[PDB]
Amino acid sequence: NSNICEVCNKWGRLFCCDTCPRSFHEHCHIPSVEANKNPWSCIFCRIKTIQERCPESQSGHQESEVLMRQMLPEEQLKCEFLLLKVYCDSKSCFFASEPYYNREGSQGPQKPMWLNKVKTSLNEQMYTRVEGFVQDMRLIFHNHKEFYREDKFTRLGIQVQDIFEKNFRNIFAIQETS
Numbered sequence: 001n002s003n004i005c006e007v008c009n010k011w012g013r014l015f016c017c018d019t020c021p022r023s024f025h026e027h028c029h030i031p032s033v034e035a036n037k038n039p040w041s042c043i044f045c046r047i048k049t050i051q052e053r054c055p056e057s058q059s060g061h062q063e064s065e066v067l068m069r070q071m072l073p074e075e076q077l078k079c080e081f082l083l084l085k086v087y088c089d090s091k092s093c094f095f096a097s098e099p100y101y102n103r104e105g106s107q108g109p110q111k112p113m114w115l116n117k118v119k120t121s122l123n124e125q126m127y128t129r130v131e132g133f134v135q136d137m138r139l140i141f142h143n144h145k146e147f148y149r150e151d152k153f154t155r156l157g158i159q160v161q162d163i164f165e166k167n168f169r170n171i172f173a174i175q176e177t178s
């Protein structure tokens, strides 16, 4: 097994996957690492199992169809994984905790959003469809773009949103287009 957390790349109190070599801090894994369960399989293993049980699940899909899916256990897991993939980028630190807005020439967003809030919402099963989760995620980056205007700090929103969007397309097998 790895000696660093797969998500934050730091050592510490790590839990090890029994079916692959990754390791996780307790609250870096999503959902949080489960109390008992030997063997334990991490979210990367559980996602790979889904694909292996249903190979045709990798054929291309339309985004509009994916967004209307109900949050049944397999969609729930996919959204948790996608969230996790965003936390794996170090620039997600800018979007993890609750922001505040006091900048000359800008007004704060009407509906603030941040990654820990989405994490909690997922955990408390507050999304009924994929669309709910995806809307909140995109809201994070949109609010950032709008608030930071022409400051070059806006680019952080672009970069982290690109990580989201690529992983979204991969995890939900969205039909490739030009």
Ligand SMILES: [Zn+2]
Pocket: 005, 006, 007, 008, 009, 010, 024, 025, 028
């Ligand atoms: Zn970690």
Ligand SMILES: [Zn+2]
Pocket: 017, 018, 019, 020, 021, 022, 041, 042, 043, 044, 045
């Ligand atoms: Zn694993």
Ligand SMILES: [Zn+2]
Pocket: 053, 054, 055, 056
């Ligand atoms: Zn099948």
